[PDB]
Amino acid sequence: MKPYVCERCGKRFVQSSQLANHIRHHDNIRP
Numbered sequence: 001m002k003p004y005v006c007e008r009c010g011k012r013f014v015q016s017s018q019l020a021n022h023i024r025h026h027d028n029i030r031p
């Protein structure tokens with residue numbers, strides 16, 4: 001719940017769980 005933002009791509013979701021995984025799914029893509 002509540003609008004959450006994955007500013008590292010720009011996609012925003014209200015999912016606290018999906019965000020938590022999404023941000024982690026971001027910081028691994030780097031070298």
Ligand SMILES: [Zn+2]
Nearest residue numbers: 006008009022
């Ligand atoms: Zn993202």
